[PDB]
Specification:
It is classed as toxin. The entry lists the keywords jztx-34 peptide toxin, hNav1.1 channel sodium channel, toxin. The assembly is monomeric. This protein has 35 residues and is mostly beta strands. It has one domain. It has no helices and 2 strands. A two-stranded antiparallel sheet has the order 1-2.
Amino acid sequence: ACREWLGGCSKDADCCAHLECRKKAPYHCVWDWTV
């Protein structure tokens, strides 16, 4: 599940890479340097 930015997510291992799962719903990948 290598979800890209705003592709959604379920893991906190930054889903795909250089990301993070938005700990506030809707849960989706955001850049570790953004949001």
